[PDB]
Amino acid sequence: RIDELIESGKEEGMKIDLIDGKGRGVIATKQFSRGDFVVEYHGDLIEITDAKKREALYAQDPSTGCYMYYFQYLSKTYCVDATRETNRLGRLINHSKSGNCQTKLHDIDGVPHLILIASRDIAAGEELLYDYGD
Amino acid sequence: RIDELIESGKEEGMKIDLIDGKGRGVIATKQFSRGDFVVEYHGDLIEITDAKKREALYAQDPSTGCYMYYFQYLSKTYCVDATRETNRLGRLINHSKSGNCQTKLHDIDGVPHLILIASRDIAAGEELLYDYGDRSKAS
Ligand SMILES: */C=C\C(=O)NCCCNc1nc(N2CCCC2)nc2cc(OCCN)c(OC)cc12
Ligand SMILES: */C=C\C(=O)NCCCNc1nc(N2CCCC2)nc2cc(OCCN)c(OC)cc12
């Protein structure tokens, strides 16, 4: 239904670009409707003890930012750790208080996935910008 | 003991300074022996449900970093949120993979407090630098 895109792992309709005056960002290359799946925030799904271990081990200054997103799913606390400098576009989508992408928890076979959903219609060539949807 | 230093918020023994090449840091103005209490990482103590609402409402870009520290306490997941720019020095202590300060969970009347203890002897004049508590099965 929508699990198909998650399992796919494809990241279609977006590309990397220099936003002139902004620096790096992710750009829509196709039109999105409100409600459409945009992209997964891909990362290791881990419990909170492993998250504390990884956090303590990563050789990163906290001033450069954190890729570890905590959330609660079915009474349990999880972490999606995108620290690995992957080639996934989801973790390079920039933030904005008034974004065109909101976060959603999507469950497949009991496993939570952190995905971005279009919160409005988006034009080809627009910058994809996320907000914490809650 | 450590506990009245914490509830008092008195943070003596350290001072803000600009370090050559680095910018703001916190400096030891007295000696600390290994194991001594240094400072609390002080913030609002909140449950994760409110951590997520706060995270969603802050107009902060993630590339300048996050003051929100998640941990588990007995049953629940809590968060220490030091986002607010306060008078408190714990949140300004820079990070290092080879620092002189370790985090630990210190409890006071059933409330978790995330504190920095000295991981080695610190001389006055040294910059305080923190790492997240090491995990070992040793004494
Ligand atoms: C992705 C891992 C990560 O960034 N974790 C952030 C955890 C919370 N943020 C900070 N936590 C602390 N302490 C934890 C307990 C002892 C200190 N300290 C800082 C210090 C910071 O800056 C100091 C000045 N450069 C920042 O900057 C955002 C965050 C945290
Ligand atoms: C103190 C709040 C905080 O920093 N929270 C961090 C949450 C995890 N970090 C990031 N999470 C996301 N998403 C969560 C779900 C949708 C997107 N995205 C980013 C993007 C980032 O960079 C964008 C490109 N500059 C960063 O940079 C560290 C972190 C997160």
Numbering used by the authors:
A (entry chain B): 246 to 379
B (entry chain A): 246 to 384
Wording from the paper:
The development of high-affinity SETD8 inhibitors with canonical target-engagement modes is challenging, and led us to exploit covalent inhibitors. Our prior efforts led to the development of covalent inhibitors containing 2,4-diaminoquinazoline arylamide and multi-substituted quinone scaffolds by targeting Cys311. Upon further optimization of these scaffolds, we identified MS4138 (Inh1) and SGSS05NS (Inh2), two structurally distinct covalent inhibitors with the desired potency against SETD8. X-ray crystal structures of SETD8 were then solved in complex with Inh1 and Inh2, respectively. Notably, despite the overall structural similarity of the pre-SET, SET, and SET-I motifs, the Inh1- and Inh2-SETD8 binary complexes (BC-Inh1 and BC-Inh2) differ from the SETD8-SAH-H4 ternary complex (TC) by the distinct conformations of their post-SET motifs. The post-SET motif of TC was characterized by its U-shaped topology with a double-kinked loop-helix-helix architecture, which appears to be optimally oriented for binding both SAM and a peptide substrate. In comparison, BC-Inh1 and BC-Inh2 rotate their post-SET motifs by 140° and 60°, respectively. Moreover, the post-SET motifs of BC-Inh1 and BC-Inh2 adopt more extended configurations with a less structured loop and a singly-kinked helix, respectively. Whereas multiple factors may influence the overall conformations, the formation of Cys311 adducts likely made the key contribution to the discovery of these hidden post-SET motif conformers. Interconversions between metastable conformers cover a broad spatio-temporal scale in particular associated with motions of SETD8’s SET-I and post-SET motifs. In the apo landscape, the general structural features of the X-ray structures of BC-Inh1, BC-Inh2, APO, BC-SAM and TC are recapitulated by a subset of macrostates (e.g. A6 for BC-Inh1; A10 for BC-Inh2; A12 for APO; A20 for BC-SAM; A22, A24 for TC, 6 of 24 macrostates, Figure 11).
Protein lysine methyltransferases (PKMTs) comprise a subfamily of posttranslational modifying enzymes that transfer a methyl group from the cofactor S-adenosyl-L-methionine (SAM). SETD8 (SET8/Pr-SET7/KMT5A) is the sole PKMT annotated for monomethylation of histone H4 lysine 20 (H4K20me) and many nonhistone targets such as the tumor suppressor p53 and the p53-stabilizing factor Numb. Disruption of endogenous SETD8 leads to cell cycle arrest and chromatin decondensation, consistent with essential roles for SETD8 in transcriptional regulation and DNA damage response. Here we solved four distinct crystal structures of SETD8 in alternative ligand-binding states with covalent SETD8 inhibitors and native ligands.
